């Protein structure tokens, strides 16, 4: 598939550009047909693993249809405006304008910086720039910013040949930052992101640095900031969070300490399952349960290497991003006995509960419907799985809605931060 989709894309991009029949030559600078690109933007399969390489595609005319797809699919939670394909000193530059609505996503003025609050009255621009190699950046960046804390810059980087440790790429990027610092600031760039594509099907890496001192935002290291909501970080707001980096980049583990009570330590792992290919043979239900399983294995191994000293209510959050043909009952099926298979490992590790998020193609409407399975180890006697949908309530906030008989969180708002151990308060 990684081959097939890598090719599948090429045809879709160039087919968006091409406007004319054989022999007559096509227009030098022409807009791409969004009806034709739409089926690549609104796709349930992964796209970002295979797409970045086409931003430094040879031709500058698909490069721009590549850009749009990226922007238009990263900013699925935003109200996107219009996009201009500019032309820099060297490589092209793409500018999109955008703004965020008030129920954009499950846990509700920006997605990645939850402290960016604005009134009922706010103006937000973004740059996309492709580069070929990290050395290219410094020259490109300053000129690029000129098309002018509220803006956003995403920089793609087609190669890092001649680099070894991340950490040496990190302080390269820090150099590049601290040399353009005041110039980034003048473009009111709130958050800039370097995104390194790949070819064998690995998911891009992401580095993001914020604010006036462009220090790295560790908490959203390998996720496009626009989609960081898939991590649902807001729900950790009663804890001082800190990442623990891992070799699996679909996995974001965080040490949490209740601000209120330094003795309430936990680890929240939040894994993400994008999907690029399902096998013909197997059921959907069968697919959900292997990767869930896989992911929980990879997850458990990291905790069984990390120092989980006085942790207690350790928590796992698996997030599927695709849409699936399956049924709520079949979904619930798949996670029957899900943890039990891990009982001794979850026991030794103090993992008390796990939450899965799946989306279901509605049989009739064909529209996507979000489920949560909340599995709770507590009351150790048995494991209860409570199944919800997500619904907008009276107030306008997304909310759990049980599938059967009311559950623990039957109409709680999905954004509810995990409660703290209060009895540990002085
Ligand atoms: Cl993607």
Residue numbers in the entry: 1036 to 1143, 1156 to 1169, 1172 to 1197, 1218 to 1495
Question: What wording appears in the published article?
Answer:
ACC carries two distinct catalytic activities, biotin carboxylase (BC) and carboxyltransferase (CT), and its biotin is linked covalently to the biotin carboxyl carrier protein (BCCP).
To assess the functional importance of this binding site, we created the R1173A/R1260A double mutant and found that its catalytic activity was only mildly inhibited upon treatment with activated SNF1. The overall structure of the phosphorylated AC3–AC5 is nearly the same as that of unphosphorylated AC3–AC5 alone, with r.m.s. distance of 0.48 Å for their 402 equivalent Cα atoms. However, there is a large difference in the position of AC5 relative to AC3–AC4 compared with the structure of these domains in the holoenzyme. With domains AC3–AC4 in overlay between the structures of the (phosphorylated) AC3–AC5 and the holoenzyme, the orientation of AC5 differs by a rotation of 40°. The overall structure of phosphorylated AC3–AC5 is similar to that of phosphorylated AC1–AC5 of ScACC reported recently, with r.m.s. distance of 0.63 Å for 391 equivalent Cα atoms between them.
